[PDB]
Design an enzyme around this catalytic site. Sequence first.
Site, mmCIF file in Angstrom:
data_model
loop_
_atom_site.group_PDB
_atom_site.id
_atom_site.type_symbol
_atom_site.label_atom_id
_atom_site.label_comp_id
_atom_site.label_asym_id
_atom_site.label_seq_id
_atom_site.Cartn_x
_atom_site.Cartn_y
_atom_site.Cartn_z
ATOM 1 N N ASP A 189 -16.795 -47.719 34.287
ATOM 2 C CA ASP A 189 -15.602 -48.537 34.466
ATOM 3 C C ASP A 189 -14.425 -47.650 34.868
ATOM 4 O O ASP A 189 -13.677 -47.156 34.025
ATOM 5 C CB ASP A 189 -15.308 -49.290 33.161
ATOM 6 C CG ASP A 189 -13.982 -50.024 33.186
ATOM 7 O OD1 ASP A 189 -13.474 -50.330 34.284
ATOM 8 O OD2 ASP A 189 -13.451 -50.312 32.092
ATOM 9 N N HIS A 345 -11.164 -40.101 30.345
ATOM 10 C CA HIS A 345 -11.708 -40.095 31.695
ATOM 11 C C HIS A 345 -10.936 -39.024 32.457
ATOM 12 O O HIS A 345 -9.836 -38.646 32.051
ATOM 13 C CB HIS A 345 -11.449 -41.445 32.371
ATOM 14 C CG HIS A 345 -12.637 -42.352 32.403
ATOM 15 N ND1 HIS A 345 -13.798 -42.032 33.074
ATOM 16 C CD2 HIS A 345 -12.832 -43.583 31.878
ATOM 17 C CE1 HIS A 345 -14.657 -43.031 32.962
ATOM 18 N NE2 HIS A 345 -14.094 -43.984 32.241
ATOM 19 N N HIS A 379 -17.504 -40.932 31.193
ATOM 20 C CA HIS A 379 -18.863 -41.036 30.651
ATOM 21 C C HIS A 379 -19.695 -40.153 31.577
ATOM 22 O O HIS A 379 -20.555 -40.635 32.323
ATOM 23 C CB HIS A 379 -19.380 -42.474 30.739
ATOM 24 C CG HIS A 379 -18.588 -43.458 29.938
ATOM 25 N ND1 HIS A 379 -18.586 -43.467 28.560
ATOM 26 C CD2 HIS A 379 -17.783 -44.475 30.321
ATOM 27 C CE1 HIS A 379 -17.814 -44.448 28.128
ATOM 28 N NE2 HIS A 379 -17.315 -45.075 29.177
ATOM 29 N N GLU A 404 -24.844 -44.482 33.715
ATOM 30 C CA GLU A 404 -24.319 -45.788 33.331
ATOM 31 C C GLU A 404 -24.790 -46.804 34.371
ATOM 32 O O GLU A 404 -24.520 -46.662 35.566
ATOM 33 C CB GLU A 404 -22.786 -45.805 33.236
ATOM 34 C CG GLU A 404 -22.229 -47.241 33.229
ATOM 35 C CD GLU A 404 -20.969 -47.448 32.389
ATOM 36 O OE1 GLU A 404 -20.321 -46.464 31.971
ATOM 37 O OE2 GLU A 404 -20.620 -48.625 32.158
ATOM 38 N N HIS A 406 -24.357 -50.310 33.786
ATOM 39 C CA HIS A 406 -23.794 -51.534 33.223
ATOM 40 C C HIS A 406 -24.020 -52.809 34.050
ATOM 41 O O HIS A 406 -24.307 -53.865 33.495
ATOM 42 C CB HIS A 406 -22.293 -51.320 32.972
ATOM 43 C CG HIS A 406 -21.719 -52.190 31.896
ATOM 44 N ND1 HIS A 406 -20.472 -51.967 31.350
ATOM 45 C CD2 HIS A 406 -22.210 -53.289 31.271
ATOM 46 C CE1 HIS A 406 -20.220 -52.890 30.436
ATOM 47 N NE2 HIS A 406 -21.259 -53.704 30.370
ATOM 48 N N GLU A 449 -23.504 -47.569 28.305
ATOM 49 C CA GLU A 449 -23.841 -48.923 28.742
ATOM 50 C C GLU A 449 -24.960 -49.015 29.775
ATOM 51 O O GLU A 449 -24.746 -49.402 30.925
ATOM 52 C CB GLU A 449 -22.564 -49.599 29.266
ATOM 53 C CG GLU A 449 -21.451 -49.569 28.215
ATOM 54 C CD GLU A 449 -20.124 -50.128 28.699
ATOM 55 O OE1 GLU A 449 -19.602 -49.647 29.726
ATOM 56 O OE2 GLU A 449 -19.593 -51.040 28.033
ATOM 57 N N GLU A 525 -16.364 -46.093 20.744
ATOM 58 C CA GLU A 525 -15.209 -46.751 21.341
ATOM 59 C C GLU A 525 -14.637 -47.784 20.374
ATOM 60 O O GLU A 525 -15.380 -48.572 19.791
ATOM 61 C CB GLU A 525 -15.604 -47.444 22.661
ATOM 62 C CG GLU A 525 -15.873 -46.498 23.820
ATOM 63 C CD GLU A 525 -16.364 -47.214 25.073
ATOM 64 O OE1 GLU A 525 -15.865 -48.320 25.367
ATOM 65 O OE2 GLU A 525 -17.238 -46.663 25.775
ATOM 66 N N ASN A 585 -12.497 -56.894 42.509
ATOM 67 C CA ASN A 585 -11.798 -55.879 41.727
ATOM 68 C C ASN A 585 -11.491 -56.459 40.351
ATOM 69 O O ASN A 585 -11.510 -57.677 40.168
ATOM 70 C CB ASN A 585 -10.493 -55.474 42.420
ATOM 71 C CG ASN A 585 -9.440 -56.561 42.356
ATOM 72 O OD1 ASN A 585 -8.918 -56.869 41.285
ATOM 73 N ND2 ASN A 585 -9.129 -57.158 43.505
ATOM 74 N N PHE A 589 -7.331 -54.302 34.367
ATOM 75 C CA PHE A 589 -8.249 -53.834 33.334
ATOM 76 C C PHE A 589 -8.502 -52.325 33.356
ATOM 77 O O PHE A 589 -9.126 -51.791 32.453
ATOM 78 C CB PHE A 589 -9.579 -54.591 33.417
ATOM 79 C CG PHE A 589 -9.432 -56.087 33.325
ATOM 80 C CD1 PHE A 589 -8.529 -56.657 32.432
ATOM 81 C CD2 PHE A 589 -10.200 -56.928 34.124
ATOM 82 C CE1 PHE A 589 -8.394 -58.040 32.337
ATOM 83 C CE2 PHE A 589 -10.071 -58.312 34.037
ATOM 84 C CZ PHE A 589 -9.168 -58.868 33.142
ATOM 85 N N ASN A 592 -5.675 -49.092 30.015
ATOM 86 C CA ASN A 592 -5.727 -49.315 28.577
ATOM 87 C C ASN A 592 -5.634 -47.997 27.822
ATOM 88 O O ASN A 592 -6.290 -47.804 26.803
ATOM 89 C CB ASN A 592 -7.002 -50.067 28.165
ATOM 90 C CG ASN A 592 -8.150 -49.856 29.125
ATOM 91 O OD1 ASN A 592 -8.395 -50.675 30.007
ATOM 92 N ND2 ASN A 592 -8.860 -48.751 28.961
HETATM 93 MG MG LIG Z 1 -19.245 -50.076 31.632
HETATM 94 NA NA NA Z 2 -10.359 -51.537 30.791
#
Ligand SMILES: [Mg+2]
Ligand code: NA
EC number: 3.2.1.23
Lengths: 1010, 1011
Positions: A189, A345, A379, A404, A406, A449, A525, A585, A589, A592
């Site tokens: 992400d 990240h 990650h 990952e 996901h 994930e 997390e 997109n 999000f 954070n």
């Molecule tokens: Mg993910």
């Molecule tokens: Na987010």
Amino acid sequence: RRDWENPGVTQLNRLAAHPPFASWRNSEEARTDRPSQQLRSLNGEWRFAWFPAPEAVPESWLECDLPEADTVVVPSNWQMHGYDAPIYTNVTYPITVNPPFVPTENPTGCYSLTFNVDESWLQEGQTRIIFDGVNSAFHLWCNGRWVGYGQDSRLPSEFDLSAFLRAGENRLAVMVLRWSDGSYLEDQDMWRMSGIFRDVSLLHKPTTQISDFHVATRFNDDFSRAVLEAEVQMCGELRDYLRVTVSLWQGETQVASGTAPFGGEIIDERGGYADRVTLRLNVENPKLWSAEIPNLYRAVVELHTADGTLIEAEACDVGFREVRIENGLLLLNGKPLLIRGVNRHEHHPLHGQVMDEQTMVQDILLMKQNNFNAVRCSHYPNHPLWYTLCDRYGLYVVDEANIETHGMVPMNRLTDDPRWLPAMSERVTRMVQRDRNHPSVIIWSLGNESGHGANHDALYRWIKSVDPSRPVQYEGGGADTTATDIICPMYARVDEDQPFPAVPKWSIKKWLSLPGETRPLILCEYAHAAGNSLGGFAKYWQAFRQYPRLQGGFVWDWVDQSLIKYDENGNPWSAYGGDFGDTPNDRQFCMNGLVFADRTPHPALTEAKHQQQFFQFRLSGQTIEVTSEYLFRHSDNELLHWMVALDGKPLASGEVPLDVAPQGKQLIELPELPQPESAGQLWLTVRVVQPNATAWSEAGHISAWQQWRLAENLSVTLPAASHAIPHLTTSEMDFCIELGNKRWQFNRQSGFLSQMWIGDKKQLLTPLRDQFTRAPLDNDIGVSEATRIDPNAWVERWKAAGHYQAEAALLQCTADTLADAVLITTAHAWQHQGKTLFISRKTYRIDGSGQMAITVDVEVASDTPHPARIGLNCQLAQVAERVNWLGLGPQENYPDRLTAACFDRWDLPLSDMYTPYVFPSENGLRCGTRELNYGPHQWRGDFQFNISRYSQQQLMETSHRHLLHAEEGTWLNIDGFHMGIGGDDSWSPSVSAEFQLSAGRYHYQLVWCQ
Amino acid sequence: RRDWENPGVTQLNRLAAHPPFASWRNSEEARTDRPSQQLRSLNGEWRFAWFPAPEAVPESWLECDLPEADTVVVPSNWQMHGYDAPIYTNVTYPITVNPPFVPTENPTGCYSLTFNVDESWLQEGQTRIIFDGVNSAFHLWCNGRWVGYGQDSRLPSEFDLSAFLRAGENRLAVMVLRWSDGSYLEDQDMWRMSGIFRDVSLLHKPTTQISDFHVATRFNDDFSRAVLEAEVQMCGELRDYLRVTVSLWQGETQVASGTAPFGGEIIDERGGYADRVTLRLNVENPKLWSAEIPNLYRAVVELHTADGTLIEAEACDVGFREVRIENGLLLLNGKPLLIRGVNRHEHHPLHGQVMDEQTMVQDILLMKQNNFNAVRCSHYPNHPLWYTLCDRYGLYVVDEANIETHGMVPMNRLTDDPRWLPAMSERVTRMVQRDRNHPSVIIWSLGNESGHGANHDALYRWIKSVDPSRPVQYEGGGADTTATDIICPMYARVDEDQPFPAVPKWSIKKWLSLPGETRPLILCEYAHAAGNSLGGFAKYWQAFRQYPRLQGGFVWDWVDQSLIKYDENGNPWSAYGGDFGDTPNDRQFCMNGLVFADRTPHPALTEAKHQQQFFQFRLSGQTIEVTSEYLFRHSDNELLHWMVALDGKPLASGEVPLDVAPQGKQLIELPELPQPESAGQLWLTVRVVQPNATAWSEAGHISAWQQWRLAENLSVTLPAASHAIPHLTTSEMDFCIELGNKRWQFNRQSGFLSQMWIGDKKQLLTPLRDQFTRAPLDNDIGVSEATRIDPNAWVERWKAAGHYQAEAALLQCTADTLADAVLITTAHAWQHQGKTLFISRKTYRIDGSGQMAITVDVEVASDTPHPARIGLNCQLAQVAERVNWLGLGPQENYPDRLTAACFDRWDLPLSDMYTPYVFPSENGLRCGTRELNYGPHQWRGDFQFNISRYSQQQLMETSHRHLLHAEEGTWLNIDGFHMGIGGDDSWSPSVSAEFQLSAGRYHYQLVWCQK
Ligand SMILES: [Mg+2]
Ligand code: NA
Ligand SMILES: [Mg+2]
Ligand SMILES: [Mg+2]
Ligand SMILES: [Mg+2]
Ligand SMILES: [Mg+2]
Ligand SMILES: [Mg+2]
Ligand SMILES: [Mg+2]
Ligand code: NA
Ligand code: NA
Ligand code: NA
Ligand code: NA
Ligand code: NA
Ligand code: NA
Ligand code: NA
């Protein structure tokens, strides 16, 4: 061959992975970790050309520079140079899910570099090129000849160029593919970018060389003794005169040294490793490594001849520490850890995913200054310098494989497929081979994930087998599978269970005692920090401290992933998902973090610092009990300051040196404090200050604090009879009260205070009216959208209930004259679809003193969703420079996020009363306020408030902060009650019940005066 | 790109592995496992051309046939067609060890085939080609266009040819490389060959197809109830109207059936598998599968539409059985197994490594007829039919991954290297994906002799994760690493420890109780059967039966890996390492099976059969106690035959029906037996006979036997006084005894009986002399060579001590006359370098009855290595047709391998008294013999003997059996004592102490007379 669409081919002609090398030809240079002439950087200006697909790259490019090419800086992500758009998508893959195929239109970056190579490098030895990071796959050519191929954008890919280079000028050509079968294992992400984003360098090694080495440290029961074991491997021709010397240094002191020829012990029926040797060094009373005290030794590995001629030397920082799980507890040097971590990240608002030392140091300093002691590499393996910094500054690290998936359905579709075992194994095995000697790495992670497949179990066992010194964890498939030594859920709540089918998220307290469960629980997390968040953060820490097996977690996450864009006037503004034309997109999000992209702190960071304090406090009479949560260090750089004030007015203070052993306690007796005269509440505030600067902080750094209400003396004094009596003027349309130089006007049809005058000057721009809503926070919104509405989200519940559309209907408006005052009584009903949502009953009492006493009693229909707030609001006509208040502060704080704020007298410029969250929403609130001063106005009572140039309406209708415009005057929101902000996760209601406004009937009172 | 020199590339465009498919388009056909029109065989005549290297292959070969090519049969190993030589090497790699590179001179076989494809196969669906076995790597082209690449010589490689075929004629071109990086993982001890040695076929599947299916069976506590769970996976377009029906059959009876649309349960946050479905079928009182009773059900998997239209059907045989390890024991359906196994390589004397149904069935029948219930696929996945036969006939199978890197230094150099994990993983995972539905497979093996690397632990866990129904074993790195659920050593001895550094081989009894050890122990390899071997086999079985956690082992091994060659006259002969010009090579080490390459039994096979019997016996008075070792079956096809005989002469017999429950006992009281008249030993012999024929045996099959000595009446009667008295004639050169038509000639210079006459016919060609040596057996030799002598090997110790060169020195030779006989007394000393090794003192007493009593007393220097034997030998002038003897037989038997033999009167043609071991050595001995008859001669006493047309000297000097030439007369070897043969392993002395001739002083007596 289209190797980028084949998971069976993850590289071609790539050299084996290994720990950081520099090939020093001088032992002292290796010991002091100084620059090596054998390690050249190729960073700088390169030639670059963008193509829509590899089929579009002209063959001539392999032989010479393309005229259309530009000169750009490397490392870099080509999206940051504007060649194509960066894409922000969370779960959904940025490409059609059709493994192992990728789009035919595959953005291709053609990098080239013409550089010089000294003949001394080709004369003998081996010259290799190292690409620390290429996203996501690439082919390499040297002087027109094909060299190799490589995948996995987060680990170095090395190739031998010895036979491709010539003395003098040489030209490298690198074709980087944006998409490849590797992309299927890189669905993290974050912004999807590409290019050569990490260092590129040339390393010269002798033909007879150290090809690998592992450093291990085992201890006796009390850690008073240790053995450093170093296994060394060589490549080249074996000779009996060859030797390996491993020496250990502590500063300039040589602690130990050992030498031996090559040839290991017998391993099986065929013998042993003739090309390897293991040295064992004894160390008495080793200085142990921890995040508390990052004691480090330097190990130097010299490959030489028996006569004493050095061939080459390699080295690494050594941290003596043991990591083990015993009886359900994660222990470091025998003590149970309490992980104060955060997910981080690799992100920079201008350079994208390119990392620099300056930014890394800045992040680490901010982390330690805010009481964090751990970081998770979410990650993927990080830039190599990151581990060096964590080793030296002292941070526990979770090194995570770049895996990952996901976006797959189900999530384990690829990880349970044996055909993907090879590609996955390389992402785990090469990470271990690279970072295994770093003491800061205390836990290995199999990725993120990707559900739970058989490939996870296989790689879990591979790690436990090759490196039993570190636990292995992985959250996929339910957080407690056979592939993890640690129960590591993401967003599991403290007391509330979330029984999802197959992968439930149990309350963490409950998870620990499930039948048969014995493992420690550390959240990989938790406390999603999207915008105005971290509500309930204190609930996590109270549990971590009470439950031995609840050993902490990693907050999600460190920094907002916003990027910098420029408007017409060339001014910068923070952009998020979709602001680059990228679609699909996931908009805002990507933001954070506890800090803004430029590293400016979000208010939530202080709440984290406070809850993660290393000193606990308790008060009893005149006694303060200080408890140390440190496991190894004594409080040798701490002094306790204490202050007692009456309603913000200092009365006494002092300071005492702190001398508490790890896990110990210290009792501090406060001097007898003289009972104050005037009425009011006494408050005791203590803070721990570090007198001396450290590698991570300045002298005077405050590491902890706490407050307590002491004695309180209620005012019983009667105010002197007023000199004048307010006058009431009744007209068909208004009730006007006049007193001296002031006027109050109440509209009889609306029932609100529509205007107030000080002399001939109007004080309001908008009438004073009840307010029950707030500009939705990220947590209030969740994943709800116009195209896809989540009727469960708070904002959707409020909208459907009519909260944002409810109109005030007047029920009553009367005026009465009292002996020494005028009394206005009103009653309003807020309705929607013939449904009464709220009922507000008020009384305004204006006396001869000129003060207006406002009493408010509200009724909230039990079947309407609980309101975001219950208060009053108005647009003040004036704009003042400062805001002064007696309450919790100085920073923004909410009901479920106010433990870090302290009660006192605060004064800040108006602008500081607004928090610039990229995505606008209710912000800047301050709770537990008894007095607020703004311009000539003063409000007294017990309320929460926010004050700024932006109305709730504008905050709600604006998508980006740079689009907000200061409105006329000042908007004031004074709440009797405000709902919690939540944050346990940001896709479902997370405000705990005790912070919801469900009482049904509410009462609050304010006094407005001059 | 030289994909064959890159362990990173093990295949290109290869389809996923899966259980055997046939894509039936008719359900009844799937139920009865009848041929499918959708599964075509491409076996038969192909075009083939040999090349020294892939660079030598002409580009024209891709488009059309090479006129130079020959037409050959496929499957086959091209070495068997004589294109190049097969190589026999054990440990040392056949190529220079330089991973991942192979020699530039890389034998390349170019196969091609022009075949027809009907348009119906191309108008719809998918057409794939299947290569069940290609050694060791290959590239594939169809109609001139490149299709793919593949490695791993022992598993099928499949490719989609839908886009490459056209209606009518099509041509495939397959370039097979002998060597590849895959060769580094295929260092098994066997002939190194190459080619398309397993079937090639074409399979048509609909576009919407069954792409995989796993069958599992779970049971309740007493196995009275079970649930069959079938997970089915599909490929193609998902449609709500699609359905999967799984039905279970027991013969023609349908036991259960279930149907469901696709869509599996929720698995994680992203949902579940929309392309999968799991059917669960309840089965009450299921008929359980075991090697004892191979009950099988048939599961039919139908992919169809809701309206009832069949799209395609797949199926498999299902055996309801549970395999689990609990409290240290390997259990099958809740009972502790006793593995009577053997290692079996896929080898054929004429076809090399190409397997055929007939040979497979033959091996299985011989195995079960000789009481074997288990087989280990040493050391790779087998031809797919092998598992089907084991399922149906009933044999426990250890399926083993094609991974052996024995030649590396150290052995785990590649297996502990993460860069080789990918290649290794495919060899393990594709094996599991292919064979997981076979009930016969009860244990997975990670490979063989590749040390212990981290890659092993990773793959060990992968298997445990994907298939918890079977235990995983691996012997590398010490037999008890973290990569094995079973302690599975190779050649660990019963009582003797072999404390090798790092990888010791502890006594198996001791191994079990080492501190903290709890696992069961089953030897993956034991009782090395090289030539005259299996000495001490009974010792393993006594231990297996007494120790619960010692659950058996797999003998090494089933068949000699000899190959047929033809001499100048066209006569066939068995060849071994080096006979094809192959060098380096490990010569005869490729022959250590229980049966010859043509499946003829070696004598050792019967020892195995006897020790592996499923019935145990005890005798007490007149009561015989029969205990059953069966775990599931009652003795419903067994009757006990008993026989009592006096020195071979039958006195009484009978038969009693056997009715014993598994693990039970049955008491049988023998009738009151009448006392014999003459003196002698009464012997009781019992044998279990199966009256009715079975799938693996004919009516009358003997499955077990045992003998006991009953009452013995010693002869106390003296022989009637003879009529005549022997006459002695003394000369300076001889002592001649004469009696009637008989004459004995003793040479006074040599001290030996140099000649005997019956009438005027001489009876000897070579004097009767002492013998203390034997033509060395494989076990006596070990790994010793003229270029590399192993001073520890028995043969070397004997040679160094001078046992083979010792000369007899006459110490005494006198003649004395008695009242009724002549007595010759002799004494000899055998010396070497002034060292007296042995001293033989004898007396020959020739009396009036014509009988010659020979008393022999031997002294053996305590410091000389114990001698192979202590007896006499001579070359008889005569050649007779039959050999009759009262003693142990009828087959060859030695001191440490005679439990299977029975005492009785045996009569065989002379030829059967010789065992044709490919590598000549001492052979044919028969022990515990009290009487031997040959021609006009009779010998009495208590001795061991062998008799044939081959002298010990010739056997010892000849390398191959087909080079032996019958000598004049007959060589007789009569031993008072003979050393054991050993066999625990064949590279170190393995003859147990109790079977070594170490007494120092020995005594025996023989009586020679005319029959
Ligand atoms: Mg993910
Ligand atoms: Na987010
Ligand atoms: Mg690829
Ligand atoms: Mg507090
Ligand atoms: Mg390859
Ligand atoms: Mg045609
Ligand atoms: Mg081997
Ligand atoms: Mg017996
Ligand atoms: Na805790
Ligand atoms: Na201090
Ligand atoms: Na907004
Ligand atoms: Na046993
Ligand atoms: Na052998
Ligand atoms: Na019976
Ligand atoms: Na021989």
